[PDB]
Design a protein around this ligand. Structure first.
Ligand SMILES: COc1cc(C(=O)N2CC[C@@H](O)[C@H](C)C2)cc2nc(NCc3cccc(Cl)c3)oc12
Ligand SMILES: *[C@@H]1O[C@H](CO)[C@@H](O)[C@H](O)[C@H]1NC(C)=O
Lengths: 11, 250, 27
């Protein structure tokens, strides 16, 4: 995963 | 984007990233046209020959972004999809005619310094600006070359090319719902879109009223930044009856 | 109403580094 983690509330 | 440069902060505030969940990755570009509607290329959502068929729940919209990979806390905004609308005469089988889709967001996004919608052309805008030689601007987080990836949003300015030249660059049938852009081989400047930039906007700044209009949607090319090839863009004004129908209906 | 006017550019009458390239092409 190159991308930084998205806040859980969006996922 | 090949042979472009790093965008300035707030340079393209209508820029949207389509972001795949599971697995987290760049799906495509797109653009913000109101506080609830996002415009992209149909083939970013539906393309059977590559087994692409994304449903609302498969993706997120990321607005306000500059870095490709970072979560831009307090800058970006991340939106969920309500519904996808694909042009009913989108032609994925032959030539990506009518390569256009709209996405309604579950909640309006708030505008900011980084987040702000682009205009859609009316007939007059298109007739004035969509002319061979006139330049527009393409932005995206796509590939830096054909065969790597940028830290930040990339911009390139590219001239609209004559229809016959567009047509003679390819064996694909070019319709009136497309236009192409890019420098020729003798012109000695380069630049193109590439993998990951589809869906994003080709914009032009009206010299009449000093507003940015989205004249095109990044669609396809044969490779990226190849001598003698051009980028093909969806002609936004020619599809605007569809757009207006979808937004007025839904 | 306010479409296509960028808060950090047009709203503040600041130009970006290459928009003049566009304008010069509109001959
Ligand atoms: C389905 O999506 C695509 C298909 C093909 C492609 O293999 N085709 C052969 C078959 C025929 O039916 C299609 C019309 C084209 C190339 C593509 N390139 C992009 N995007 C990147 C990009 C690069 C350079 C300039 C632009 Cl404007 C955008 O998407 C593409
Ligand atoms: C794409 O997915 C939707 C819902 O999963 C389905 O109804 C549609 O027929 C699919 N189209 C394909 C796989 O070509």
């Amino acid at each position: 995963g190159d991308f930084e983690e998205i806040p859980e509330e969006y996922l | 984007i090949v042979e472009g440069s790093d965008a300035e902060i707030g340079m393209s505030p209508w820029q949207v990233m389509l972001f795949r969940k599971s697995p987290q990755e760049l799906l495509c570009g797109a653009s913000l046209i109101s506080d609830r509607w996002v415009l992209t290329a149909a083939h970013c959502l539906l393309y059977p020959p590559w087994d692409k068929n994304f449903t609302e729940n498969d993706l997120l919209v990321r607005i306000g972004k500059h870095s490709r990979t970072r979560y831009e806390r307090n800058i970006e905004k991340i939106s969920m999809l309500e519904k996808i609308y694909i042009h009913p005469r989108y032609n994925w089988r032959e030539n990506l005619d009518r390569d256009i889709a709209l996405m309604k967001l579950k909640k309006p996004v708030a505008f900011s310094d980084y987040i702000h919608p682009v205009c859609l052309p009316d007939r007059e805008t298109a007739a004035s600006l969509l002319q061979a030689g006139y330049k527009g601007r393409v932005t995206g987080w796509g590939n830096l070359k054909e065969t790597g990836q940028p830290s930040v949003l990339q911009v390139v300015n590219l001239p609209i090319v004559e229809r016959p030249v567009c047509k003679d660059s390819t064996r694909i049938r070019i319709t009136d719902n497309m236009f192409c852009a890019g420098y020729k081989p003798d012109e000695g400047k380069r630049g193109d879109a590439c993998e990951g930039d589809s869906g994003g906007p080709f914009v032009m700044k009206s010299p009449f009223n000093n507003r940015w209009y989205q004249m095109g949607i990044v669609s396809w090319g044969e490779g990226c930044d190849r001598d003698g090839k051009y980028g093909f863009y969806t002609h936004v004004f020619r599809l605007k009856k569809w757009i207006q129908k979808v937004i007025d209906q839904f | 109403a306010d479409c296509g006017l960028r808060p950090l550019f047009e709203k503040k009458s600041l130009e970006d580094k290459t928009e003049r390239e566009l304008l010069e092409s509109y001959i």
